[PDB]
Amino acid sequence: SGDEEFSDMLRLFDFNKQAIQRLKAEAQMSIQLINKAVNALINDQLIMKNHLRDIMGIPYCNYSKYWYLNHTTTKCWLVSNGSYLNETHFSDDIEQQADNMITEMLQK
Amino acid sequence: GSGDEEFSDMLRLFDFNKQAIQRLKAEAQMSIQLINKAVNALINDQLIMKNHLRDIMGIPYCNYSKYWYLNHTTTGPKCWLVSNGSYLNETHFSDDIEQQADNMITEMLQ
């Protein structure tokens, strides 16, 4: 393609790429705030469960819980030590893949 | 619609951004569903707690007016906001416009 056509399409491309990256970063920030808040809720709730005599008899759900869980998606405690949320990190691989892609287009 | 070699280039750049959008959609939906699982587990256990803890078994659950109490509370209670109907549904992002792209380029190509 002509170089001016390629420059224009490349500019529109860059624009949408930057918008995607912006949304990616903003969503990741808000999700991390939610993760911190939820993990704090879990911490305090576990302390409460460990110190409240009226609920000291209630066990933590065993593995079958995941299908007990499947009523709403498809007793006992669902929140446990292993309920904390990991860090959410969106991938950036496709960006460098684009860079390499149009680099080879500009060298071929 | 334009020259075929030009259109192939713009269509390749288009593919790249479409694939990036799909990737972001899938990753965000995954993390949001994990959060939904965690929040629903919190709701379940908190309701058990509220139903068995004698010091708080007198507190009623908030009725429908809560939502405007809630709106005022966002700017600035005697009852529970989390109830049986506080669980989060599964979040599913839409994909219709993706094949709308297919339809678009299909009409463009002849």
Added chain:
Amino acid sequence: SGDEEFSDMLRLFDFNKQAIQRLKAEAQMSIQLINKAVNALINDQLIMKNHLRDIMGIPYCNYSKYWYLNHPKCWLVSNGSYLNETHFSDDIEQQADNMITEMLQKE
């Protein structure tokens, strides 16, 4: 760039822009529902902490909690644990409008 070539690349552009906007709105909706749910949990848990006599000896964590994070029993959820409204930005969209505006003013 000939006007018909620019129209084709511009239509493909519009499509991906619209898809980004759709995803932005849906993600913001789901995130806000999560925020409402978490804030309701926080509110009720604070009520609970205020009315459960057996656990009132437990303090709320002081500022050192943030380094507790980098790894002591105290409360992490407090009055200032609520989640703000999530609002994704649109600054770059009108910049696109201006971008193609100057491109079409050279036509």
